[PDB]
Design an enzyme around this catalytic site. Structure first.
Site, PDB file in Angstrom:
ATOM      1  N   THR G   1       0.817  -1.162   0.036  1.00 43.45           N
ATOM      2  CA  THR G   1      -0.105   0.185   0.109  1.00 43.45           C
ATOM      3  C   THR G   1       0.863   1.337   0.121  1.00 43.45           C
ATOM      4  O   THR G   1       2.078   1.324   0.710  1.00 43.45           O
ATOM      5  CB  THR G   1      -0.854   0.055   1.302  1.00 43.45           C
ATOM      6  OG1 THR G   1      -2.028  -0.984   1.120  1.00 43.45           O
ATOM      7  CG2 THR G   1      -1.528   1.388   1.415  1.00 43.45           C
ATOM      8  N   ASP G  17      -2.921   4.178  -3.799  1.00 41.04           N
ATOM      9  CA  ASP G  17      -2.750   3.249  -5.028  1.00 41.04           C
ATOM     10  C   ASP G  17      -4.330   2.325  -4.663  1.00 41.04           C
ATOM     11  O   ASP G  17      -4.849   2.550  -3.696  1.00 41.04           O
ATOM     12  CB  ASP G  17      -1.529   2.220  -4.852  1.00 41.04           C
ATOM     13  CG  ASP G  17      -1.798   1.397  -3.754  1.00 41.04           C
ATOM     14  OD1 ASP G  17      -1.874   1.573  -2.382  1.00 41.04           O
ATOM     15  OD2 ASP G  17      -1.857   0.085  -4.343  1.00 41.04           O
ATOM     16  N   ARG G  19      -4.444  -1.248  -5.005  1.00 37.50           N
ATOM     17  CA  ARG G  19      -4.142  -2.836  -4.735  1.00 37.50           C
ATOM     18  C   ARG G  19      -4.574  -3.273  -3.427  1.00 37.50           C
ATOM     19  O   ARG G  19      -4.149  -2.620  -2.281  1.00 37.50           O
ATOM     20  CB  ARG G  19      -2.687  -3.010  -5.173  1.00 37.50           C
ATOM     21  CG  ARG G  19      -2.189  -4.589  -4.843  1.00 37.50           C
ATOM     22  CD  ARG G  19      -0.756  -5.071  -5.330  1.00 37.50           C
ATOM     23  NE  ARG G  19      -0.649  -4.905  -6.820  1.00 37.50           N
ATOM     24  CZ  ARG G  19       0.302  -5.112  -7.407  1.00 37.50           C
ATOM     25  NH1 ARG G  19       1.370  -5.310  -6.904  1.00 37.50           N
ATOM     26  NH2 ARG G  19       0.486  -4.916  -8.686  1.00 37.50           N
ATOM     27  N   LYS G  33      -8.961   2.788  -1.161  1.00 35.47           N
ATOM     28  CA  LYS G  33      -8.330   3.393   0.341  1.00 35.47           C
ATOM     29  C   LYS G  33      -8.828   4.719   0.817  1.00 35.47           C
ATOM     30  O   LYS G  33      -8.233   4.909   1.975  1.00 35.47           O
ATOM     31  CB  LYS G  33      -6.934   2.844   0.232  1.00 35.47           C
ATOM     32  CG  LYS G  33      -6.755   1.853  -0.279  1.00 35.47           C
ATOM     33  CD  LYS G  33      -5.243   1.365  -0.500  1.00 35.47           C
ATOM     34  CE  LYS G  33      -5.072   0.040  -1.200  1.00 35.47           C
ATOM     35  NZ  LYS G  33      -3.472  -0.445  -1.524  1.00 35.47           N
ATOM     36  N   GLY G  47      -2.528  -0.855   6.147  1.00 32.93           N
ATOM     37  CA  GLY G  47      -2.588  -1.777   7.194  1.00 32.93           C
ATOM     38  C   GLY G  47      -3.652  -2.877   7.118  1.00 32.93           C
ATOM     39  O   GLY G  47      -4.171  -3.044   5.908  1.00 32.93           O
ATOM     40  N   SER G 129       3.554   0.022   2.651  1.00 31.24           N
ATOM     41  CA  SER G 129       4.701  -0.841   1.954  1.00 31.24           C
ATOM     42  C   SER G 129       5.301   0.107   1.053  1.00 31.24           C
ATOM     43  O   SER G 129       6.655   0.083   0.854  1.00 31.24           O
ATOM     44  CB  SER G 129       4.419  -2.042   1.465  1.00 31.24           C
ATOM     45  OG  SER G 129       3.410  -2.070   0.703  1.00 31.24           O
ATOM     46  N   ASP G 166       7.029  -0.862  -5.532  1.00 28.24           N
ATOM     47  CA  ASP G 166       6.593  -1.717  -4.151  1.00 28.24           C
ATOM     48  C   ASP G 166       5.407  -2.537  -4.915  1.00 28.24           C
ATOM     49  O   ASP G 166       4.497  -2.521  -5.644  1.00 28.24           O
ATOM     50  CB  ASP G 166       6.014  -0.955  -3.438  1.00 28.24           C
ATOM     51  CG  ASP G 166       5.187  -1.645  -2.145  1.00 28.24           C
ATOM     52  OD1 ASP G 166       5.831  -2.696  -1.878  1.00 28.24           O
ATOM     53  OD2 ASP G 166       4.210  -1.222  -1.709  1.00 28.24           O
ATOM     54  N   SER G 169       2.002  -2.587  -3.802  1.00 32.99           N
ATOM     55  CA  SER G 169       1.314  -1.355  -4.265  1.00 32.99           C
ATOM     56  C   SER G 169       0.929  -1.703  -5.798  1.00 32.99           C
ATOM     57  O   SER G 169       1.726  -2.462  -6.490  1.00 32.99           O
ATOM     58  CB  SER G 169       1.539  -0.116  -3.983  1.00 32.99           C
ATOM     59  OG  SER G 169       1.912   0.096  -2.515  1.00 32.99           O
TER      60      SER G 169
HETATM   61  C1  SA1 Z   1      -1.959  -1.986   2.471  1.00 34.37           C
HETATM   62  O1  SA1 Z   1      -1.632  -1.431   3.445  1.00 34.37           O
HETATM   63  C2  SA1 Z   1      -2.388  -3.091   2.256  1.00 34.37           C
HETATM   64  C3  SA1 Z   1      -3.838  -3.106   1.817  1.00 34.37           C
HETATM   65  O2  SA1 Z   1      -4.306  -4.381   1.215  1.00 34.37           O
HETATM   66  C4  SA1 Z   1      -5.105  -2.391   2.409  1.00 34.37           C
HETATM   67  C5  SA1 Z   1      -6.499  -2.605   1.846  1.00 34.37           C
HETATM   68  C6  SA1 Z   1      -7.533  -1.790   2.046  1.00 34.37           C
HETATM   69  C7  SA1 Z   1      -7.176  -0.608   2.961  1.00 34.37           C
HETATM   70  C8  SA1 Z   1      -5.942  -0.671   3.858  1.00 34.37           C
HETATM   71  C9  SA1 Z   1      -4.958  -1.139   3.024  1.00 34.37           C
HETATM   72  N1  SA1 Z   1      -2.621  -3.644   3.286  1.00 34.37           N
HETATM   73  C10 SA1 Z   1      -2.043  -5.027   3.388  1.00 34.37           C
HETATM   74  O3  SA1 Z   1      -2.087  -5.781   4.436  1.00 34.37           O
HETATM   75  C11 SA1 Z   1      -1.686  -5.497   2.116  1.00 34.37           C
HETATM   76  C12 SA1 Z   1      -0.516  -6.383   2.086  1.00 34.37           C
HETATM   77  C13 SA1 Z   1       0.652  -5.240   2.209  1.00 34.37           C
HETATM   78  O4  SA1 Z   1      -0.096  -3.848   1.935  1.00 34.37           O
HETATM   79  C14 SA1 Z   1      -1.595  -4.195   1.373  1.00 34.37           C
HETATM   80  C15 SA1 Z   1      -1.311  -4.210  -0.137  1.00 34.37           C
END
Ligand code: SA1
Ligand code: SA1
Lengths: 244, 244, 204, 233, 243, 196, 222, 250
Positions: G1, G17, G19, G33, G47, G129, G166, G169
């Site tokens: 993220t 982003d 993803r 997000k 998170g 990340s 990343d 992301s």
């Molecule tokens: C990003 O932090 C990320 C997202 O999946 C998540 C989704 C919706 C709102 C909060 C952010 N959190 C995660 O645990 C995955 C793995 C690594 O980061 C994510 C892509």
């Protein structure tokens, strides 16, 4: 202290009667009349709307007939707000039963539970009882069509035909006069309207002052169906039965 | 109607709280006690009626200390007085525990005030049957206070309550006019001894025992201490002399 | 150890032209041991369909819970619940158990009775809503399902076509998963009608 | 008047009185007489035990709270059991926690505060019993008088109960005399019996009727009943 | 039946006598107070009466500093007044802690009014025999005056008065505003607003005041404070050199 | 983290680096570790950012209510509230706090509350990972009753050294001057303190 | 993220982003997000998705009630205090990392909250990340007094750093601009630099390809 | 201390009446008139701003409150009781619905929630019934527009148009004459203003009257853009000026 202001809603009279229950029943006797008639092929619930206006929205109204289950409904006579409190808990109990046994709750079990709740306000807690009386119309696969009644005391009984609210004495005598074990839903529907028609404290008996419901087992299906008649539907049946 | 004086938190038609007023009667019926604010401290004194020769002299102390810098004395129902001091003590311990510094007299007064005011908010409790004169020395000076059963309190130059409160107040007002510059702790102790003796006339029937205590920045280091031995007798005499 | 790998099973939902499809395998096992070949994982409340993979006891409990809740909803609202709303009910019900969650992977499918718009959604075990427009997968063969779907899927497929697509996705993914299979069932959903078809597959 | 302001302890009368408390005090007066007196070395409790029938026992009126403390009761016996039990715990606490014997003056303050709580809240009732506490502590011999109102006083001697006024005047007279009976328990006890007989009228103190207790310098609070009190009648 | 006058339950006329008698208690102190809004300040004047010569005048007040920005004047017995002050302070401090900004005058008022509404509905709580006038210079609303009564009612004012001779002060102020046509004292300095305040206090009550007959509280941007006997005297002198 | 408080002739000064890390990553390079709990009572925060913030927010609340009822609180009283929170919750907190306040009667005062929740009143105090490196320096250069300029200098040199050796410290040096004259904010950038 | 916040001369802008991942699998290729706390206070979450989401709605719900009760517009510092005290209480067990921005009667604000409950203030921020790729860009192009358009570009570029560099992301860039005097504008999919190329073949199966055992109609009408 | 009033304060009399409810209704009767009218494309609720003093700022006291972005309330009776009832209603819309279904409750259900709150003050220990009657107007996708009345007993009923308070009898009668099932929102607003005039003694303008409507969506009142499905609140309070413009065509 506070004792000074305690009405003591749960005590016996020297005659062994419960003041509050008695007074609540008195309250119920001024409520629109509700009738319950059980036929061989169904059950009929009819009620008279107490007080009405030209401006009252009837299409969106419901003050006497409530659905508890897809197989059980009740007709109310008394404080609407009090009835709604009890109806909601009745609905929850039905679902708890369903979730536990994966079977719809037998009609008596639901009635005994609601009545037991009422009985409670009668023996402890220091609170006023619910100013409500119910007529229960339901169906289950152990006793089929059933008609019950519960009042503020927490007592309940089964009937082939019954009424609660105003002029029950007059209503009961008329019902006990023309009721017949082999009746048919259509017959009962007619009896119900005739009874209310003769006990009304109002001029005429129009559709805008009635609520109607039937619990039948639609031959072309095999399951039980509840039908809460719509304004127009009541207006129709009111003409057909010869009351126009 | 009437009956507005039977329950404690009830407002009478004229906006009064009769139970609080009846509580006052219990206070007026009590022994007289006073307080005198001096240039760097405060003095407390009280009348102790000698019911009989059987009372061990000097033993039944009435003045009470709170923390280490506050003195409290009261007239009325003694037990109610102790009850209030106990709370005061917890109130002071709590304050010191959190803020480190011993509790200021103004802060301490409101603690007692809110507590007493609280006993006039419900009919499940009775108002305090005592008026309390308390005070001490703190970060910025000396402070004297009197608290009524209503929870009302103000800071005083001098104060009295009980049987001979009028004589006392009278004597106190004299000192206030004849000493705009301030009385000394040493002087206040004597003056106090006199006021009790004088005010003792409204109870001249029974013999009594004098009790004094003080809190002076210079005389006691700002700590509440009882007047004993020589200093006591010297004051008793100063009184016995001006009583004739 | 992993509550989500004890009983096995999969569910997949796809959107088509004025239609939605939801499918699942029929297996219920105890680790290596197959126990039931009739454990359906799809349920419905009115016109809203819910598939659930994960720990069987929770799959059963959740279905009973949502029946219970959608029943009271109908009694008070005087109308059947919609896909979008149910999805929120599922989400909040799962999150309510945030620190002692149900070990499931829910999937919602249905058509809005008023807008006619098709709807599918997935959730993690603590209610996070995943609202995709194409497909949603869940279960012990979810990786395989993602692969199948990503390739086999295309927009606006007709009911008869979406059926072939979703069935092939489910089938071939289940055959690469030790804990899935032993039967399958596919639901083709349209505004007016819903057809349920059982598929023929390997029994090993 | 009164009738409207005596239904519970939480109500003040128009003159500032607490009738329930006063009605409780009445239960004491209806109780059998008991006396207490002390010199500088000892403290004594003399109590007249009352019997129901001539086939019944004479209800005990003295309770030991610790090895250095004890009391005599006049009024509702049950309430003395409660209050003495509380005094027993308080003495026990002082010992266990601070390895200190509880000061008689401190015990008095504790009794006052426990009684007070029952005179300011709705629901309770005042205690209906009077108590005379005697004990030898770090400051010598002591005697206390406890009233249900919550008022506790330290004295050289006193009496409570029916016709108590007799003994009380006698002591208020004999004061200068008994207060000096140091180092001679028997003399103090006799003086106690002489004060108590000043409240007789019905009968005369007999062996199974008289009850005496003493505590002091080298005397742990001990109770004498029957034969043991024969040498004092 | 006749107890519908002891606790807060309806009388057959739909009245709550206990609330009415509580209003009666507010005048027990026989003190009058008034508040007016300046251009960028808010002033509250209140009579100060110290009968007993044995009292320490410095400790007699019905004005309270609730927060750095909110001031409150109370019409009613002191014990109930102090009970209301403590609660308001606690409430003001917690609001700041939880929401991260200073509690607005109108909000503090609504909160106290709701608490009052409750004693009006629950039988075990008696109403407080007081009327609370809150003032400040809100960061969003500007100079503010909000007052609450034993009925749990509250509203904002352009200016207001409270006490035995409330009506006289009120009509006096009403007249001035019918004349000026604006809803505030168009003065740049609070000193002059304080003077206007005291002046009309005199006109309406037909009385003269010394420096120890009054009590004044002022609210400005980010601060509310009370004046001293001397700050007042300086005020009394200024108004003297005009009449 | 590197933080310190120093009492001097006209009052007291607080100082700190502006770095918050999560491992070797600098999550914030302009952090403000100098927190106000009252007009003339501030604190220096080290340890857990989350814990110290929550602690401070509560102390500020407590002192606000204290002021409403009893007037301005003494620096000692503020330190006591901090202490209460740190000692009573020692098992769940990681907070090293230095309390600094200016009183008119007491002038400047410094109380240091280390990990266990104990309190220590001192002429000056240092804390945080970076402090270990400047124990000798500070002990050798501190003097009581220094002037405002000398004190700012002492803090500037001490911290720049702490920042120099400690990877857990860095960014800018922030200072807060507490005197009868009021409250002054000072900041010093890398290009200045690095070449001292 | 990758989520970022960037203040500009008359407001604040936040972006992220799209993803969503479960371990190494991309669950949602276009999740959102950016959540709303109140009309003009928006959040960017990183998170545990269920947590950022749940926490944003809880405080959002209470912020609405607070607004209605005080008859005032919600303030960013209020959502921040409510969020941090909630997160603190749960000792980091609520895996929510947020960048909260917005405009209110007191001005425009930009903050960040961590799961444990600590908050930070700055002109530019990023979490997730992708945090480090984004921040690298921000440390390289930020400057004080950015225009609305510059801020958008900067923020958008920061997320791209994450999308490309990343693995945590990817996909698109969502933006939300909150300007001091206007309505907040949510720009969903402001950038879509990752469109999938046309497949090489169609996998549409001929009808009848799947073997069926039994068929029936499902009853939906009660 | 401690509320020791654990028994009902509203009980049945020998006649079967519930005294406190009756008295509460009487309190409602003395209250300023308020009304609601349903049109085919909206609903209007209005009342009089009975300023208790000219020094009071009538704007700082709204008798018409927004419960949800598509539901509003107005009353007749005890103002303080109404205020707390609104706080409780706004919160229950959230706690018992929005936090569960992610959407605001439909008018009948929120009304039902309020009614329950009121019914409890009729039976719970140590309390008195609420001294108010509310008229709630709202809109929701599956029920369209609606108007409800909730009395102290907790009872509620749907209306096409109705009035409560002081001159409810007269006003209800005047409404029965002008109401039809083809009224447009503006028509209802007009009829509402006329009805309210008969109940007002003194000044009758946009500063003495308070009026709100449940109508079309106000995207301009949303506060943000970017989400197609979010079009704005249907509830809108009219401005002083907007009222006066309509009073000229009275
Ligand atoms: C990003 O932090 C990320 C997202 O999946 C998540 C989704 C919706 C709102 C909060 C952010 N959190 C995660 O645990 C995955 C793995 C690594 O980061 C994510 C892509
Ligand atoms: C310092 O102690 C430090 C800071 O991150 C922290 C941030 C804000 C106020 C308290 C101090 N704490 C830490 O855990 C890191 C790692 C080493 O020290 C930090 C830089």
């Amino acid at each position: 202290g506070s004792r000074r202001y305690d009405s003591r809603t749960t005590i016996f009279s020297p005659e062994g009667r419960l003041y509050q229950v008695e007074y609540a029943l008195e309250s119920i006797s001024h409520a629109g009349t509700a009738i319950g008639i059980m036929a061989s092929d169904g059950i009929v619930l009819a009620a008279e709307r107490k007080v009405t206006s030209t401006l009252l929205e009837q299409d969106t109204s419901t003050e006497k007939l409530y659905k508890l289950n897809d197989k059980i409904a009740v007709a109310v006579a008394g404080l609407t707000a009090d009835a709604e409190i009890l109806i909601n808990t009745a609905r929850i109990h039905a679902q708890n039963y369903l979730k536990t046994y994966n079977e719809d709750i037998p009609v008596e079990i639901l009635v005994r539970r609601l009545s037991d709740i009422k009985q409670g306000y009668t023996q402890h807690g220091g609170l006023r009882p619910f100013g409500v009386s119910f007529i229960y119309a339901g169906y289950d696969d152990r006793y089929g069509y059933q008609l019950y009644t519960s009042n503020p005391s927490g007592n309940y009984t089964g009937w082939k035909a019954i009424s609660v609210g105003a002029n029950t004495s007059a209503a009961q005598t008329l019902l006990q006069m023309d009721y017949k074990d082999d009746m048919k839903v259509d017959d009962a529907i007619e009896l119900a309207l005739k009874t209310l028609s003769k006990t009304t404290d109002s001029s005429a008996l129009t559709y805008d002052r009635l609520e109607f419901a039937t619990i039948r087992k639609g031959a072309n299906d095999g399951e039980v169906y509840q039908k809460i008649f719509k304004p127009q539907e009541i207006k129709d049946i009111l003409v057909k039965t010869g009351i126009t | 109607g009437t009956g507005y004086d039977l329950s404690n938190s009830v407002f009478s038609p004229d906006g009064r709280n009769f139970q609080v007023e009846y509580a006052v009667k219990a206070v007026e019926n009590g022994t007289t006690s006073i307080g005198i604010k001096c240039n760097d401290g405060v003095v407390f004194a009280v009348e102790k009626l000698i019911t009989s020769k059987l009372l061990v002299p000097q033993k039944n102390v009435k003045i009470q200390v709170v923390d280490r810098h506050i003195g409290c004395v009261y007239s009325g129902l003694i037990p109610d007085g102790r009850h209030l001091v106990n709370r005061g003590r917890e109130e002071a311990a709590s304050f010191k525990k959190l803020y480190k510094t011993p509790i200021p007299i103004p802060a301490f007064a409101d603690r007692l005030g809110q507590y007493v005011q609280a006993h006039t908010l419900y009919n499940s409790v009775r108002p305090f049957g005592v008026s309390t004169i308390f005070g001490g020395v703190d970060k910025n000076g000396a402070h004297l206070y009197m608290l009524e059963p209503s929870g009302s309190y103000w800071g005083y130059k001098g104060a009295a309550t009980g049987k001979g409160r009028q004589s006392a107040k009278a004597e106190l007002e004299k000192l206030v006019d004849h000493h705009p510059e301030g009385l000394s702790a040493r002087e206040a102790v004597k003056q106090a001894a006199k006021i009790i003796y004088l005010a003792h006339e409204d109870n001249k029937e029974k013999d009594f025992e004098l009790e004094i205590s003080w809190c002076s920045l210079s005389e006691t280091n700002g700590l509440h201490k009882f007047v004993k031995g020589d200093l006591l007798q010297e004051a008793i005499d100063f009184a016995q002399k001006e009583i004739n | 150890s992993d509550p989500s790998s004890i009983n096995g099973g999969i569910v997949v939902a796809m959107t088509g032209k004025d239609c939605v499809a939801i499918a699942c395998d029929l297996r219920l096992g105890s680790q290596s041991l197959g126990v039931s070949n009739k454990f359906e994982k799809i349920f419905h409340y009115g016109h809203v369909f819910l598939g659930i993979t994960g720990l069987a006891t929770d799959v059963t409990t959740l279905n009973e819970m949502f029946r219970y809740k959608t029943n009271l909803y109908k009694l008070k609202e005087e109308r059947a619940i919609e896909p979008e709303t149910f999805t929120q009910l599922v989400s909040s019900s799962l999150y309510e158990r945030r620190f002692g969650p149900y070990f499931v992977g829910p999937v919602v499918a249905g058509i809005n009775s008023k807008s006619g718009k098709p709807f599918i959604a997935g959730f993690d075990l603590i209610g996070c809503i995943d609202e995709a427009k194409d497909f949603i997968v869940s279960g012990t063969a979810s990786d395989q399902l993602f692969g199948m779907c990503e390739s086999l899927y295309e927009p606006n497929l007709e009911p008869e076509d979406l059926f072939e697509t979703i069935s092939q996705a489910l089938l071939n993914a289940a055959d690469r998963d030790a804990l899935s299979g032993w039967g399958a069932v596919v639901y083709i959903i349209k505004k007016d009608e819903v057809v349920k078809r059982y598929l023929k597959m390997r029994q090993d | 008047f009164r009738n409207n302001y005596d239904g519970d302890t939480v109500t003040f009368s128009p003159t500032g009185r607490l009738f329930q408390v006063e009605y409780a005090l009445e239960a004491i007066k209806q109780g059998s007489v008991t006396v207490g007196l002390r010199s500088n070395t000892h403290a004594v409790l003399v109590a007249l035990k009352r019997n129901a029938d001539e086939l019944s026992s004479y209800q005990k009126k003295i309770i030991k709270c610790d090895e250095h403390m004890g009391l005599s009761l006049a009024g509702l016996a049950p309430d003395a059991r409660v209050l003495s039990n509380y005094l027993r715990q308080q003495c026990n606490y002082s010992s266990l926690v601070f390895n200190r014997k509880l000061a008689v003056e401190r015990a008095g303050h504790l009794l006052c505060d426990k009684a007070q709580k029952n005179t300011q809240s709705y629901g309770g009732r005042p205690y209906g019993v009077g108590l005379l506490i005697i004990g030898y502590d770090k400051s010598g011999a002591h005697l206390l008088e406890f009233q249900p109102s919550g008022n506790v006083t330290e004295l050289y001697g006193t009496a409570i109960g029916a016709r108590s006024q007799g003994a009380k005047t006698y002591l208020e007279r004999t004061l200068d005399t008994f207060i000096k009976i140091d180092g001679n328990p028997d003399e103090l006890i006799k003086a106690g019996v002489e004060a108590i007989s000043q409240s007789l009228r019905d009968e005369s103190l007999t062996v199974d009727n008289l009850s005496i207790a003493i505590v002091g310098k080298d005397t742990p609070f001990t109770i004498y009943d029957g034969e043991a009190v024969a040498k004092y009648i | 039946a006749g107890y519908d006058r002891h606790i807060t339950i309806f009388s057959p006329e739909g009245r709550l006598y206990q609330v009415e008698y509580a209003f009666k208690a507010t005048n027990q102190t026989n003190i009058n107070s008034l508040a007016v809004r300046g251009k960028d300040c808010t002033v509250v004047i209140s009579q100060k009466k110290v009968p007993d010569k044995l009292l320490d005048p410095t400790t007699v007040s019905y004005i309270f500093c609730i927060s750095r920005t909110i001031g409150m004047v109370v019409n009613g017995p002191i014990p109930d007044a102090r009970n209301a002050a403590l609660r308001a302070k606690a409430e003001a401090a917690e609001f700041r802690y939880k929401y991260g900004y200073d509690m607005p005058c109108d909000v503090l008022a609504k909160r106290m009014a709701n608490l009052s509404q409750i004693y009006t509905q629950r039988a075990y709580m008696r109403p407080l025999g007081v009327i609370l006038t809150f003032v400040s210079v809100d960061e969003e609303l500007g100079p503010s005056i909000y007052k609450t009564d034993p009925a749990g009612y509250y509203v904002g004012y352009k200016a207001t008065a409270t006490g035995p001779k409330q009506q006289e002060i009120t009509t006096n102020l009403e007249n001035h505003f019918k004349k000026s046509k604006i809803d505030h004292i168009n003065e740049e300095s609070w000193e002059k607003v304080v003077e206007f305040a005291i002046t009309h206090m005199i006109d309406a009550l037909g009385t003269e005041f010394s420096k120890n007959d009054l009590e004044v509280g002022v609210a400005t941007k980010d601060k509310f404070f009370t004046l001293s006997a001397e700050n007042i005297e300086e005020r009394l002198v200024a108004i003297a050199e005009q009449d | 983290t590197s933080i310190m408080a120093v009492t001097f002739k006209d009052g007291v000064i607080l100082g700190a680096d502006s770095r918050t890390t999560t491992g070797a990553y600098i999550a914030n390079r302009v952090t403000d570790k100098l927190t106000r709990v009252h007009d003339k009572i501030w604190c220096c925060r080290s340890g857990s950012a989350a814990d110290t913030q929550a602690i401070a927010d509560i102390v500020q609340y407590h002192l606000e209510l204290y002021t409403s009822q009893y007037g301005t609180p003494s620096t000692e009283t503020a330190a006591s509230v901090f202490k209460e929170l740190c000692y009573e919750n020692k098992d769940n907190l990681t907070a090293g706090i230095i309390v600094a306040g200016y009183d008119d009667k007491n002038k400047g005062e410094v109380y240091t509350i280390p990990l266990g929740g104990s309190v220590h009143k001192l002429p000056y105090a240092i804390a945080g990972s970076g402090s270990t490196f400047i124990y000798g320096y500070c002990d050798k250069n501190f003097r009581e009753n220094m002037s405002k300029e000398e004190t700012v200098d002492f803090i500037k040199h001490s911290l720049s050294q702490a920042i120099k050796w400690d990877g857990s410290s860095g960014g800018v040096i922030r200072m807060v001057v507490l005197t009868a004259a009021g409250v002054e904010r000072l900041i010093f950038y890398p290009d200045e303190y690095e070449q001292l | 993220t990758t989520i970022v916040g960037v203040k500009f001369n008359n407001g604040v802008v936040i972006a992220a982003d799209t993803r969503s991942t479960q371990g190494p699998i991309v669950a949602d290729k276009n999740c959102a997000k950016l959540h709303r706390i109140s009309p003009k206070i928006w959040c960017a979450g990183a998170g545990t998705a269920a947590d950022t989401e749940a926490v944003t709605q809880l405080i959002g719900s209470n912020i609405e009630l607070h607004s209605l009760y005080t008859s005032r517009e919600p303030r960013v510092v209020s959502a921040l205090q409510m969020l941090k005290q909630h997160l603190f209480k749960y000792q980091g067990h609520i895996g929510a990392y947020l960048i909260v921005a917005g405009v209110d009667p007191t001005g425009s604000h930009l903050f960040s909250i961590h799961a444990h409950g600590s908050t930070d203030v700055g002109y530019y921020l990023s979490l997730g990340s992708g945090s480090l790729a984004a921040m690298a860009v921000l440390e390289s192009h930020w400057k004080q007094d950015l225009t609305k358009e510059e801020a958008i570009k900067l923020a958008s570029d920061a997320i791209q750093a994450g999308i490309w560099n990343d693995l945590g992301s990817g996909s698109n860039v969502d933006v939300c601009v909150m300007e001091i005097g206007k309505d907040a504008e949510y720009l969903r999919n402001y950038l879509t630099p990752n469109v999938r190329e046309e497949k090489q073949k169609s996998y549409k199966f001929p009808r009848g390809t799947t073997a069926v055992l039994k068929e029936s109609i499902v009853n939906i009408c009660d | 201390m401690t509320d020791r009033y654990s028994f009902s304060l509203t009980t049945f009399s020998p006649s079967g009446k519930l005294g406190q409810i009756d008295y509460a209704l009487t309190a409602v009767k003395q209250g300023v008139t308020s009304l609601g009218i349903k049109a085919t494309n909206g609903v209007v609720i209005a009342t009089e701003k009975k300023s208790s003093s000219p020094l009071a700022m009538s704007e700082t006291l709204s008798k018409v409150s927004l419960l949800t972005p598509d539901i509003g309330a107005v009353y007749s009776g005890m103002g303080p009781d109404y205020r707390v009832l609104v706080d409780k209603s706004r919160k229950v819309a959230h706690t018992s619905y929005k936090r569960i279904y992610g959407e605001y409750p439909p008018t009948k259900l929120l009304v039902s929630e309020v009614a329950k709150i009121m019914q409890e003050a009729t039976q719970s220990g140590g309390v008195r019934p609420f001294g108010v009657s509310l008229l709630i107007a709202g809109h929701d996708e599956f029920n369209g527009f609606s108007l409800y009345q909730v009395d102290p007993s907790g009872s509620y009923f749907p209306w096409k148009a109705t009035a409560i308070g002081k001159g409810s009898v007269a006003a209800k009668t005047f409404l029965e004459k002008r109401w039809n099932d083809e009224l447009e929102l503006e028509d209802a607003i007009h009829i509402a203003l006329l009805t309210l005039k008969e109940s007002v003694e003194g000044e009758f303008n946009g500063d003495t009257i308070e009026l709100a409507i449940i109508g079309d969506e106000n995207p301009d009142l949303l506060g943000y853009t970017g989400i197609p499905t979010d079009k704005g609140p249907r509830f809108r309070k009219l401005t002083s000026q907007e009222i006066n413009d309509r009073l000229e065509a009275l």
